[PDB]
């Protein structure tokens, strides 16, 4: 249809580049920080790149914060079992905070014996 | 039809923007409140919303 | 209609030039507050036509 | 060449309509609800305006898309009535031996069936004229007279009935099923009030929609008549 | 095509009110400088002037006759361009089925831009495989990694423009001898006399040449209320 | 055979030159069709009437020339000269001489490939065939291997399932001995507590 | 048995060992694994075997660890997860010595049956 | 080798948190005054005027792109005539080192193989 | 325009203002508070305490604390 | 079921005794997060992203033909991240049949 929305249009040229007074090129905000830490590992993974191709994808330590650079440096089966135990221990500790020193009477020895008497009478 | 140059030299010489500085896990705890109480466009919008 | 049953309008009789109809930059200063009110009322001609054709039977039921 | 579809980038009626819906919940007066309903009617009309303006795209699939949408809507209306029939027949074992007066099978059923059949014949004549690219002014006013009688009869029946919604589940189901049909009759008034002759004729989705909808209402009443009156 | 809507009234003819009022300049404008409406009336005025002159038709060659009616003589270049246009238009709302592509005869993938997404479904019967989508970019002979079918991109491009019916006409059609307004007047008097107007486009066209509203009844014809 | 026989577009004629179907609200004028048939003659009658196109006789020499230059076109031109061409005859003439556009592959620019590469076409086809040969054989090989391996899971599941069968088997034996021999089973033992 | 009876157009390795080779590897270092079984610095290419000389379709197999540690490397040269070991060395041995395979599988199955039955019973 | 060291130079550590100085030092909210950048803010983001307040989809700054002849600018292919034939040279994407950074060397080998299919 | 090619171009090109992310996280945080704040309010309304002491509705030993 | 293309014995005969399957690497290379330049503004970063598309990459064979990036579904055919308007020109799904008509050929 003549005059309809074109099926293809060429991009117009980008706006003029900006230079500072001294001639330095102007920089713009960029959310790709260079985290500061001592880790320099580089992990590479063969990745599917369609059906007939792959790509060797690399992860660099300097692109991650300190916490991940520290964890990702260690062998997985060294850190993993420690984390599993640590997380479980923390969960138990957190929930134990709210019941420090709570001593219900129904868990005392006297009450425990009485339940045994009831079970014997009722043949539970 | 408009004619533009390939580049333009700005009058000032300040490099205001660039790569973001390295940050920690809790960097947001102080940066976010700083923006609210220190950026003009932030608290002006808040006051405008609250007032009306 | 500009659909299959009709077609375009000859230039001799075109009264809404899109160059002036569109290009709405600064339109509120060109019509003022009262003109802004009139534009809002006239935008609802479609709704107004429906109400004129819809109220009378409701009055009968009422 | 051109793109197959002229994309719609932005829309603001959705926000307005959704806010109008919320106003129903947050009302402190039933008067606001009445005026809120007018706003909903206005904004829905604007949405219908956009559909008519889309004709300028000259897209062959637009008619088909809207037609199948109506088919889905019709199915939902049928299934809604099915649920009421389901509710009615679940307590069937508790009917006909309670000390209430059920409706007569002679007066109401016959005149309503006759009255609604005339409504179908009027709409059929409208379809025939639409096929022939022709119009008859009187037809619309026959529908209004038909709808006037239906409203007058139903109002009197409810007012003179001696049993109430709280008397038994039978009475509740009778009143509710009859009201649900009335609401669908009133929705037909909303649609038919704008019937006109448009010169683009058989590419106008409104005509086929009205014919399908009016037929649905009438057939539903036959099921209601068999269940309740006969 | 199946994906087009109903023919409009304009698809058959245009209303006389769309005729340019400066006919004298219209008949002198080069084809490359005529717009859609101007080109339509140039061909209709000049085409009907020759067709409504029976005594001259038998002595007029097909080349001249085609030129007067505004019809383009077909040649291999123009035919090639038009053919690929229609194939592109047809594929907008039709399936893409054809012979298996090989190096000698690659599958032709028409496109306006530099890229178009294509899928390979292999051969016929058992040779058909699951769809394998790829981006067909200009300047590469693409080979399916599964069935080894060869694809190639054909671009409808010409001198910073993409092929269109008007573009083909302008590139290849050559303007002939300038239209003579005497022919318009001569044919006008032939079919329009004493209040009988059997050649109405010429009647309007002649009136515009004489200014506007000169011939009988034309002032009343041009006066409108809204 | 479309739209019930009503054409989307058709010509209507009026006898009064100043007639307007939208302005006037009179009730005497009768519109005519393209052939001039008045509207009160129904189409089932008018369509039977034979209408032929009459061109002014000054066009006969031209129509003769068209027939001679294109003999296949002569029979249609003769009908037109003799006033025997109906609308259907015109349509047959129109579509008979319509031809499709031609695309020439020899005019398509080709993707760039060096002479050395063009000489390796047979080699690449040869490699492709061997890949398919290897692919098809491997499918049979893998299908046999893995589906056979699934039997190991069946046998492993049967064994582990049988462990619970044995536990259930022993459980039923134990239950049969509870009410008969087990001292845990007691009678005349539980006494009502009574309301608190 | 793909190379042995199904397909005759893939290179067929020689078994260096029917047991994996244990080696310490370091992250960020690339290792080259012998795919012919004739290198003298197993499990790595020595520069004189078929893999090093690119002879008869044999090429070195590139490998790189994600983390430092001790890893098992295929000695049979047919493990599915080659260069790393996954048990294919034992499987390929059973093909060569099926009588021995029966003894090991019976013994392994016998132990598994006793422990599982003893605990559940 | 460490591939990060190859493109360390390109990655200069940042100065401000989140890449912006305080608005007092530089007002990134205002539209840029640079010629040809009226649709952008100072920090390079699109201005609210361009995208919201005067969006072209709402009828502002009406400018039909298509010309009288129904044409729009189209960039042609890189054509070459050799050996009695007109050839088109396709555009190859730049080296992945330029776009991603890692030096394209010592790439692991992944051969061509057709689809893994179950047979029999 | 090149800037309009990608949806959410500023975010995808890594130039967006961080405040957008903060609002998203704040919105999520506020959503979470709708489960905790009414819990505290309802507890105080019917008991006079924001939160119970563990097992305070049961009999406790003399030294329990 | 699909089991690959059918092959005839004659199609496997080489024209030379030294022919072996070509060892062309189909690993497109080493990649990571797309790394933009601080100097590039919004428009030029968009160009940078458009030049890093894996689905625009291919492997050139020894005869000059290229095997492109291919996917089972068209979701992997749009630019990453997805642009606002993706399929300006309708993607073509190529079917094959043995039917032919004389007009296409010339003697
Ligand atoms: C000596 C005179 C004798 C007269 C005897 C009485 C006859 C009365 C006939 C009334 C028929 C009304 C039918 C209503 C349905 C709609 C009709 C329709 O489509 O009209 C289209 C017609 C034209 O529409 P259009 O769109 O321009 O053209 C469409 C077509 O293309 C073209 O349309 P069309 O031309 O094909 O239309 C054909 C026809 C289609 O309809 C019919 O043919 C239906 C015929 C049904 C007959 C009903 C008779 C009812 C009589 C009952 C009496 C009971 C007495 C009980 C006594 C009890 C004792 C104890 O429609 C009409 O002709 C409708 C009537 C037109 C009159 C309009 C002027 C105002 C009313 C004048 C009434 C005069 C009465 C005089 C009485 C004198 C007696 C001596 O519409 C109009 O003219 C406009 C609206 C008004 C029409 C309705 C008028 C109602 C008048 C009722 C009178 C009788 C009252 C009895 C009361 C008894 C109480 C106890
Ligand atoms: C000699 C050894 C012992 C033999 C015993 C024989 C028993 C009869 C079976 C028939 C005879 C088999 C003879 C085979 C001869 C070899 C033939 C051959 O072709 O060889 C070469 C052939 C291939 O050679 P190749 O190609 O060179 O590659 C060799 C490679 O090594 C690659 O090898 P692959 O890829 O074949 O690797 C196999 C691997 C592959 O497996 C996988 O990839 C699995 C991946 C998913 C893992 C999912 C983990 C579980 C998730 C749980 C979800 C909840 C999470 C909760 C978390 C909580 C928080 C932490 O399979 C497994 O890991 C076994 C999984 C079995 C099911 C697991 C679930 C058991 C549930 C039982 C009921 C529970 C009720 C509980 C009641 C209450 C408590 C008591 O290799 C084999 O055929 C190897 C077969 C060996 C299979 C042994 C599996 C033993 C598992 C025992 C489970 C015991 C459960 C105890 C509890 C029961 C309670 C009721
Ligand atoms: C399930 C969890 C785990 C999930 C794990 C798995 C996740 C997998 C990944 C999933 C990814 C999905 C796909 C993602 C695609 C993202 C695309 C994108 O980024 O689009 C761009 C889009 C916008 O970017 P842009 O294009 O630059 O937009 C420019 C603006 O349009 C224009 O710029 P502008 O500056 O002009 O903007 C205007 C601005 C103007 O801005 C200002 O003026 C700001 C002023 C500062 C205000 C700050 C808040 C102050 C709060 C004070 C509170 C005081 C409390 C006092 C309490 C006292 C108690 C005693 O705002 C406004 O004017 C309106 C704001 C309205 C919205 C915010 C509402 C906040 C909450 C309000 C609550 C009200 C409660 C009342 C209740 C009363 C009941 C009676 O990005 C966003 O919107 C942010 C998205 C961030 C997330 C991205 C995805 C990352 C991956 C996931 C991370 C994990 C998230 C976990 C959930 C959160 C946990 C908390
Ligand atoms: C047996 C009794 C005799 C008496 C009576 O009932 C049956 O005859 C009926 C018939 O005459 C009815 C009329 C039919 C025509 C109706 C026309 C309607 O107006 C039209 O309604 C709008 C929306 O429907 C538009 O249409 C617009 O066009 C408007 O005009 C009006 O709102 C009520 C109306 C007039 C009706 C009022 C009630 C009536 C008079 C009824 C009247 C009581
Ligand atoms: C509470 C129960 C429900 C009632 C409450 C309100 C619900 C509102 C929901 C409305 C849903 C509407 C869906 C419409 C889908 C079909 C649209 C359609 O086909 O319209 C086009 C079609 C034909 O147009 P063409 O230009 O010829 O062709 C179109 C392009 N080819 O046009 C029409 O259908 C015309 C419609 C005209 C009448 C419109 C009336 C609107 C009524 C809205 C009712 C709102 C009432 C709210 C009450 C609230 C308090 C209870
Ligand atoms: C020839 C034309 C008519 C054809 C009719 C076809 C009917 C098809 C019915 C489909 C649903 C069948 C559901 C199974 C039958 C169960 C009947 C039954 O048990 O009824 C009693 C039971 C209640 O008993 P209790 O819960 O135990 O205790 C009640 C104490 N107050 O009722 C029910 O649960 C049944 C309710 C469902 C039936 C009614 C609603 C569903 C039917 C809708 C029909 C719609 C129109 C026809 C559609 C088909 C057109 C081709
Ligand atoms: C009596 C004993 C009391 C003990 C109390 C113990 C409290 C323990 C709390 C443990 C849970 C801590 C949760 C921490 C959540 C951190 C969330 C977070 O990271 O937010 C990220 C998010 C986005 O940041 P970036 O992604 O970095 O964006 C920049 C561009 N990328 O950051 C933000 O939005 C910052 C602001 C988020 C809101 C946080 C504050 C909410 C208000 C908390 C009020 C607490 C009141 C406590 C009163 C106590 C009275 C006794
Ligand atoms: Zn294929
Ligand atoms: Zn080796
Ligand atoms: Zn091994």
Short characterization:
Chain G has 121 residues and is of the alpha+beta class. Chain G has four helices and four strands; from the N terminus they run H-E-E-H-E-E-H-H.
Top keywords for this entry?
part of a larger assembly; 10 chains; F: 196 residues; mainly alpha; 7 helices; J: 107 residues; mainly beta; 1 helix; 4 strands; binds cardiolipin; binds Digitonin; binds 1,2-dioleoyl-sn-glycero-3-phosphoethanolamine; binds zinc ion; membrane (chain I); transmembrane helix (chain I); transmembrane (chain I)
Task: Give a written overview of the molecule.
Chain B: The chain crosses the membrane at residues 41-52. Chain I: Keywords: Membrane, Transmembrane, Transmembrane helix. Chain I: The chain crosses the membrane at residues 22-40. The structure is cut from a larger assembly and holds ten protein chains of ten kinds. In chain B, 46% of the residues lie in helices and 6% in strands. By secondary structure, chain B is mainly alpha-helical. Chain F has helices at 43-46, 60-69, 74-81, 87-96, 115-118, 121-176, 178-181; one strand at 110-111. Chain F is mostly helical and 196 residues long. Chain I is built from two helices and no strands. The N and C termini of chain I lie far apart (70 Å). A two-stranded antiparallel sheet of chain J has the order 2-3. Chain J starts with 26 loop residues before the first strand and ends in an 11-residue tail after the last strand. The chains are: A alpha+beta (124), B mainly alpha (52), C mainly alpha (62), D mainly alpha (230), E alpha+beta (226), F mainly alpha (196), G alpha+beta (121), H little secondary structure (120), I mainly alpha (65), J mainly beta (107). Chain E binds chain J through residues 91-92, 95-101, 103, 107, 109, 111-113, 115-124, 126-137, 140-151, and chain J through 2-3, 5-6, 55-56, 58, 61, 64-74, 76-77, 87-98, 100. The structure holds cardiolipin (3 copies), Digitonin, 1,2-dioleoyl-sn-glycero-3-phosphoethanolamine (PEE) (3 copies) and zinc ion (3 copies). One zinc ion is lined by residues 34-36, 38-39, 45, 49-51, 58 of chain G.
């Amino acid at each position: 249809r003549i005059g309809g929305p074109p099926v293809f249009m060429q991009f117009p040229p980008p706006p003029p580049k900006e230079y500072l007074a001294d001639g330095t090129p102007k920089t713009y905000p960029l959310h790709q920080p260079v985290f500061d830490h001592g880790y320099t590992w580089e992990h590479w993974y063969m990745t599917n790149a369609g059906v007939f191709h792959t790509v060797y994808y690399g992860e660099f330590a300097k692109d991650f914060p300190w916490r991940w650079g520290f964890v990702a440096e260690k062998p997985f089966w060294v850190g993993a079992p420690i984390l599993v135990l640590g997380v479980l221990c923390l969960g138990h500790i957190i929930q134990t905070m709210g019941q420090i020193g709570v001593r219900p009477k129904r868990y005392t020895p006297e009450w425990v014996e009485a339940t045994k008497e009831r079970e014997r009478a009722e043949n539970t | 039809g408009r004619e533009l140059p390939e580049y333009v030299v700005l009058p000032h010489n300040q490099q205001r923007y660039g790569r973001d500085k390295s940050y920690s896990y809790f960097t947001c705890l102080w940066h976010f409140p700083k923006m609210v109480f220190t950026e003009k466009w932030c608290y002006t919008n808040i006051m405008w919303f609250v007032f009306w | 209609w500009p659909l299959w049953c009709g077609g375009g309008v000859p230039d001799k009789f075109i009264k809404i030039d899109p160059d002036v109809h569109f290009n709405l930059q600064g339109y509120r200063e060109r019509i003022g507050w009262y003109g802004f009110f009139t534009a809002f009322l006239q935008a609802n001609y479609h709704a107004f036509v429906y109400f004129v054709r819809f109220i009378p039977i409701n009055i009968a039921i009422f | 060449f051109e793109l197959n579809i002229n994309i719609i980038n932005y829309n603001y009626l959705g926000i307005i309509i959704t806010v109008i819906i919320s106003i129903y919940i947050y009302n402190n007066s039933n008067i606001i609800s009445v005026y809120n309903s007018n706003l909903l009617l206005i904004n829905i009309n604007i949405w219908m305006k956009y559909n008519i303006l889309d004709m300028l795209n000259l897209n062959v699939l637009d008619y088909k898309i809207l037609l199948w949408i109506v088919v889905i809507i019709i199915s939902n209306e049928i299934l809604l009535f099915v649920s009421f029939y389901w509710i009615y027949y679940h307590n069937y074992i508790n009917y006909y031996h309670v000390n209430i007066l059920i409706l007569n099978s002679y007066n109401i059923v016959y005149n309503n069936i006759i009255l609604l059949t005339l409504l179908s014949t009027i709409v059929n004549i409208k379809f025939y004229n639409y096929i022939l690219s022709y119009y008859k002014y009187i037809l619309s006013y026959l529908i209004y007279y038909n709808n006037y009688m239906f409203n007058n009869k139903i109002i009197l029946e409810y007012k003179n009935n001696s049993n109430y919604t709280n008397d038994s589940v039978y009475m509740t189901s009778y009143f509710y099923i009859i009201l649900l049909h009335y609401i669908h009759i009133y929705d037909s008034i909303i649609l038919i009030v704008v019937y006109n002759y448009v010169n683009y004729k058989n590419i106008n989705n409104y005509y086929i929609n009205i014919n399908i909808y009016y037929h649905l209402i009438e057939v539903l009443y036959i099921v209601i008549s068999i269940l309740l009156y006969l | 095509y199946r994906h087009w809507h109903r023919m409009s009234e304009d698809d058959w003819a245009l209303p006389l009110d769309s005729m340019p009022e400066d006919v004298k300049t219209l008949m002198a404008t080069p084809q490359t400088e005529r717009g859609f409406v101007e080109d339509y009336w140039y061909n209709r005025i000049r085409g009907e002037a020759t067709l409504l002159d029976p005594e001259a038709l038998p002595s007029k060659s097909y080349i001249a006759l085609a030129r007067d009616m505004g019809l383009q003589i077909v040649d291999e270049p123009s035919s090639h361009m038009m053919g690929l246009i229609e194939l592109y238009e047809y594929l907008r709302g039709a399936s893409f089925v054809g012979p298996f592509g090989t190096i000698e005869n690659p599958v032709l993938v028409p496109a306006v831009g530099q890229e178009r997404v294509v899928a390979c479904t292999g051969g016929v019967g058992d040779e058909e495989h699951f769809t394998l989508w790829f981006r067909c970019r200009e300047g590469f002979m693409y080979r399916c990694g599964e069935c080894d079918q060869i694809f190639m991109l054909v671009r409808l491009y010409y001198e910073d423009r993409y092929w269109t019916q008007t573009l083909v006409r302008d590139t290849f059609m050559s303007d002939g001898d300038m239209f003579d307004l005497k022919t318009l007047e001569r044919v006008h008097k032939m079919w329009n006399k004493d209040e009988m107007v059997r050649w109405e486009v010429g009647y309007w066209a002649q009136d515009y040449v004489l200014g506007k509203g000169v011939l009988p009844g034309m002032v009343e014809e041009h006066t409108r209320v809204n | 055979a479309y739209n019930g026989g009503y054409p989307f577009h058709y010509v209507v004629q009026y006898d009064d030159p100043n007639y307007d179907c939208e302005a006037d609200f009179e009730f005497e004028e009768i519109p005519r069709d393209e052939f001039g048939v008045p509207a009160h003659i129904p189409p089932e009658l008018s369509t039977q009437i034979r209408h032929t196109y009459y061109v002014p006789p000054q066009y006969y020499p031209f129509l003769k020339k068209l027939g001679e230059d294109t003999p296949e076109l002569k029979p249609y031109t003769d009908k037109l000269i003799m006033g025997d061409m109906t609308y259907d005859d015109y349509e047959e003439m129109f579509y008979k001489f319509a031809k499709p556009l031609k695309i020439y592959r020899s005019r398509l620019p080709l993707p760039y490939r060096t002479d050395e590469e063009i000489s390796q076409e047979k080699y690449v086809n040869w490699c492709g065939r061997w890949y398919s040969y290897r692919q098809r054989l491997q499918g049979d090989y893998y299908s046999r291997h893995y589906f056979r391996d699934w039997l190991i899971g069946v046998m492993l599941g049967m064994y582990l399932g049988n462990l619970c069968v044995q536990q259930h088997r022993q459980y039923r034996v134990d239950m049969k001995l509870f009410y008969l021999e087990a001292p845990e089973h007691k009678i005349n033992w539980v006494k009502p507590r009574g309301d608190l | 048995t793909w190379t042995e009876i199904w397909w005759e157009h893939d290179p067929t390795p020689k078994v260096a060992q029917y047991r994996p080779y244990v080696c310490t590897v370091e992250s960020g270092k690339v290792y080259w694994w012998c795919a012919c079984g004739e290198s003298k610095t197993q499990p790595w290419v020595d520069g004189h075997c078929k893999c090093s000389k690119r002879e008869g379709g044999f090429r070195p197999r590139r490998w790189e660890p994600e983390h430092d540690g001790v890893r098992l490397f295929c000695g049979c040269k047919s493990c599915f997860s080659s260069p790393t070991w996954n048990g294919g060395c034992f499987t390929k041995w059973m093909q060569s010595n099926p009588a021995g395979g029966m003894l090991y599988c019976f013994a392994a199955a016998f132990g598994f049956g006793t422990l599982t039955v003893y605990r559940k019973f | 080798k460490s591939y990060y060291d190859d493109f360390k130079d390109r990655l200069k550590p940042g100065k401000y948190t989140q890449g912006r100085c305080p608005q007092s030092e530089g007002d990134y909210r205002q539209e840029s005054k640079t010629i040809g950048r009226e649709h952008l803010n100072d920090d390079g983001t699109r201005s609210k005027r361009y995208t919201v307040k005067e969006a072209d989809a709402l009828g502002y700054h009406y400018h039909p792109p298509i010309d009288k002849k129904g044409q729009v600018y189209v960039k042609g292919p890189n054509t070459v005539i050799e050996r009695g034939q007109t050839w088109i040279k396709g555009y190859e994407l730049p080296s992945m080192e330029y776009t991603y950074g890692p030096k394209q060397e010592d790439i692991p080998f992944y051969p061509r193989v057709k689809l893994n299919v179950w047979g029999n | 325009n090149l800037e309009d090619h990608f949806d959410l171009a500023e975010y995808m090109m890594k130039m967006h203002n961080p405040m957008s992310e903060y609002l998203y996280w704040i919105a999520g945080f506020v959503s979470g508070l709708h489960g905790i704040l009414p819990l505290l309010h309802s507890n105080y309304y019917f008991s006079g305490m924001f939160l119970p002491r563990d097992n305070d509705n049961t009999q406790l030993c003399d030294d329990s604390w | 079921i699909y089991e690959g293309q059918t092959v005839q014995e004659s199609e496997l005969i080489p024209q030379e005794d030294d022919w072996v399957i070509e060892e062309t690497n189909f690993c497109l290379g080493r990649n990571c997060y797309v790394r933009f330049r601080e100097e590039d503004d919004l428009a030029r970063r968009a160009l940078h992203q458009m030049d890093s598309q894996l689905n625009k990459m291919h492997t050139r064979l020894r005869d000059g033909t290229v095997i492109p990036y291919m996917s089972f579904h068209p979701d992997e055919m749009v630019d990453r991240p997805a642009p606002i308007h993706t399929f300006s020109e309708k993607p073509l799904l190529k079917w094959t049949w043995d039917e032919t008509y004389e007009e296409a050929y010339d003697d």
